[PDB]
């Protein structure tokens, strides 16, 4: 009785979860780095931000996040984590930052 | 080109923001008499220098805020509380139009 390209929606369902799943990981990881960069642990912090950075762009290639959004994320991120580690912290690694 | 306008400040009472009063002269579409008008603008003063009377210029800019899309250009003729008074009495007289 109808168009069988309703798949186009059923297709969306996968693309929905798939790109949704990655997207939760992005933030829950992004979570970590922030808390850590606030408690001096600039070591384990920039291990995550380095992981954060990769998590984003890796989805950016695909159809999830795109454009200046990764940039907008990553910016305000290392625009912040570093601006936390100013609380002594000591740049345990430039392993994220062109310090 | 970005619009260029010239007017008087009537409000400094916003933080780092001001209100510029712009006039324009032109003839009436049907009756040709040359007439004036006014529009207020909310001008950006990110270093609250400009103040009451500052006959100044402003320029169309990216949306600083709602209602607020003009940055100040430059002072032209500071101290003009005489023009300001016109805006003031006019708004004052409004009270004596209160439908009572």
């Amino acid at each position: 009785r109808n168009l069988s390209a309703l798949k186009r929606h059923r297709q969306s369902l996968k693309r929905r979860l798939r790109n949704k799943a990655k997207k939760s990981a992005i933030k829950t990881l992004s979570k970590k780095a922030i808390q850590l960069a606030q408690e001096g642990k600039a070591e384990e912090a920039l291990k995550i931000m380095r992981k954060a950075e990769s998590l984003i762009d890796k989805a950016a290639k695909g159809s999830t996040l795109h454009k200046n959004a990764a940039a907008r994320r990553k910016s305000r991120l290392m625009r912040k984590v570093r601006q936390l580690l100013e609380a002594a912290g000591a740049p345990l690694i430039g392993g994220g930052l062109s310090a | 080109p970005k619009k260029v306008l010239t007017g008087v400040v009537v409000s400094d009472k916003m933080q780092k923001t001001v209100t510029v009063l712009v006039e324009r002269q032109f003839p009436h579409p049907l009756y040709g008499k040359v007439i004036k008008r006014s529009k207020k603008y909310l001008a950006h003063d990110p270093e609250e220098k400009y103040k009451l009377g500052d006959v100044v210029e402003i320029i169309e800019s990216r949306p600083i805020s709602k209602r607020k899309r003009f940055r100040v250009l430059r002072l032209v003729e500071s101290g003009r509380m005489d023009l300001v008074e016109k805006y003031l009495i006019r708004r004052q007289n409004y009270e004596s139009l209160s439908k009572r």
Binding site: - | P27, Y31, G32, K33, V34
Partner: protein, 138 residues
């Protein structure tokens, strides 16, 4: 007080003419002047003379007319059949060089203030200007 002096001039004349007099005195200006002038240059008037009256300057304007007609009312034709202010303080009249009068089919003459001064319809067209139409005369 006089809201409009230029009108007052024209009107002073128009009043004077309708009783057929020699002269017509009127308060002085450098802008009333180069407005008259044409009226002599186009020979609507004899002409004038800057004079003073009671210590105060005026412009005795000398009136032309025509032939002592005959029949009842021998009063001659006027030179100035008609004259009226156009642009006024109540409503200023400006025109591009295109939008410009054909007063009484060439027989009449407009008078206008322009970027070169007190031209006429004919002149302002040829200089290519137009401006504040003062008045029309015939």
């Amino acid at each position: 007080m006089l809201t409009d002096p230029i009108a007052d001039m024209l009107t002073r004349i128009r009043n004077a003419t309708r009783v057929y007099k020699e002269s017509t005195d009127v308060p002085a200006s450098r802008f009333k002047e180069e407005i008259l002038r044409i009226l002599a240059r186009e020979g609507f008037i004899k002409g004038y003379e800057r004079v003073d009256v009671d210590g105060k300057p005026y412009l005795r304007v000398y009136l032309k007319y025509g032939p002592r007609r005959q029949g009842p009312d021998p009063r001659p034709e006027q030179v100035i059949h008609h004259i009226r202010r156009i642009s006024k303080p109540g409503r200023r009249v400006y025109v591009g060089v295109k939008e410009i009068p054909r007063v009484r089919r060439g027989l009449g003459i407009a008078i206008l203030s322009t970027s070169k001064g007190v031209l006429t319809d004919r002149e302002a067209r040829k200089l290519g200007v137009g401006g504040e139409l003062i008045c029309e005369v015939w």
